[PDB]
Amino acid sequence: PEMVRGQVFDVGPRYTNLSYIGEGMVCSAYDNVNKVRVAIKKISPFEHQTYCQRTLREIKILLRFRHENIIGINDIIRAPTIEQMKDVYIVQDLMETDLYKLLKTQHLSNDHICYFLYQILRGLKYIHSANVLHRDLKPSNLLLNTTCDLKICDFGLARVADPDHDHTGFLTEYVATRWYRAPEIMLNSKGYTKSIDIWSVGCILAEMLSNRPIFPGKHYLDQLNHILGILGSPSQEDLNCIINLKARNYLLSLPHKNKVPWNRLFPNADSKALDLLDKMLTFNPHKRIEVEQALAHPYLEQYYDPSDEPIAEAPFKPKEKLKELIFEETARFQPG
């Protein structure tokens, strides 16, 4: 049972020569069957039902999805019995970096931004075509290899779309990571519609243009301040779509704010990029561009090819039962 930083990282004999990547616990490791180094994440969820729920989602989703811009699961390592299974190891293609790391260190050329956005939306087209919402799109969930191929990861927070049951009250909901969370999450939305993901993609695009998050809320309640600071006050029509009174009257209480023009925030950006940005960062989720429209936008004309933007074959529909389900869902990787 081999070790790394005072912890068992027991993957053998198939996977050897381990190197620590970061934080469960992630390592690269040489795959002795396919002669390539891989990523391996050790997952230890069984003593927290929230960790079991998220692990089971990640697994079920990534096993069913097959797409060039979505990370696959190559293998899953665990004990032969439920009794002996204390951790699960998920083996994935090794990726050089992620968009979070790249944005901290690298200027992106306009051609890189265009290509990354294409790949993000291409992958999202498939996810949304399966009636699945990722719900946590952000730079660190976008993996990149040495040739800038891009793969979406971490479906632990995903849900099946449910637009008829999206409505809720004011300042309740926490969907996504704060800086990438759509304005309606704080107002009246449970984050059960596809427009939640498009907002996050818009935030990612903005961040690619300037290497800084566009809406860096310092805490949960600051996030709407940042969003409204740039988009300005919502129109009468967009307010009328918010029937809830606590949310509507909060917005009516605010002093008028004008829109900050994208070309002033992003003076070096491609004008077509800012036109698409505007449409993804639309306040009213009903008016926000959808993934298929975004793909068809002039900014992406060099790549757009709907016959090469595939869709999923069919839509997707307590701790101890979840441990059994995770055991069942991982059985295909056991010998024979």
DSSP characters over 107-173: PPPHHHHHHHHHHHHHHHHHHHHTTEE-----GGGEEE-TT--EEE---TT-EE--GGG-B--TT--
Question: Would residue 270 show up in a list of annotated catalytic residues for this protein?
Answer: no
22, β-bridge pairs: 26
Query: Does 23 appear as a known binding residue?
Result: yes
Catalytic residue among 31, 75, 98, 136: 136
C-beta atoms surrounding 4 within 10 Å: 15
Find out whether 22 is annotated in a ligand binding site: yes
d(CA 270, CA 267): 9
| Residue 125 among known ligand-binding residues | no
- List, in order, residues 6 or more apart from 333 with CB less than 8 Å away: 75, 76, 77
Distance of CA 118 to the CA centre of its chain: 15
CB atoms within 10 A of CB 22: 7
Resolution (A): 1.6
Host domain of residue 304: 97-308
CB 276 within 8 A of CB 297: yes
Here the CATH number for the domain that contains residue 161 is 1.10.510.10
Of 164, 117, 155, 166, residue with least CA distance to 133: 155
Q: What are phi and psi of 18, to 5 degrees?
A: -85, 145
Query: Strand pairing partners for 16?
Result: 30
Residue 313 CA: distances (Å) to CA of 66, 127, 134, 261, 303: 10, 11, 18, 41, 23
Give the closest residue to 282 by CA, choosing from 218, 227, 217, 222: 227
The response to whether 24 counts as a known ligand-binding position is: yes
Please list, in sequence order, all residues whose beta carbon lies within 8 angstroms of the beta carbon of residue 188, skipping any fewer than 6 positions away: 167, 168, 169, 170, 242, 243, 244, 247
Nearest C-alpha neighbor of 89 from the set 167, 178, 166, 27: 27
Q: To the nearest 10°, the Cα dihedral for 251, 257, 263, 269?
A: -40
